Amino acid sequence: RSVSSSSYRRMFGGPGTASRPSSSRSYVTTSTRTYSLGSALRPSTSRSL
C-alpha cells in the first residue's frame, strides 16, 4: 500500500511565475541638463560712443 504519486496533479511547474515585466528602471535616471541663457537676452552695450 505504497502511495503512487507521479506528477499526478498535472505537470506544469509551480503556480507560479506569470513573468511580471521587470521594466528597465535599472537604467540611470536621465540627466536633466537644461541651460538658461539669462545674460545675452539683455544686450548690455554702451551705444554712447
Place this chain on the structure above:
Amino acid sequence: YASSPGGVYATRSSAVRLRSSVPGVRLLQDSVDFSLADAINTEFKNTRTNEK
C-alpha cells in the same frame, strides 16, 4: 547661453520585464496644462503693463 545644463535629456531607461498588475488608482490631472492660467499669469502682468 547653453541649453541642457549638465548635458541633460530624457535618456531611455528600460529595465527587467516585471509583470506587475497595477489597478491604476488615477491621480487625475486638471493641470494637464492649466496653461489658460499661465497665459493668465502673463495677463496678471499685461493688466500690470496697461496700468503702468
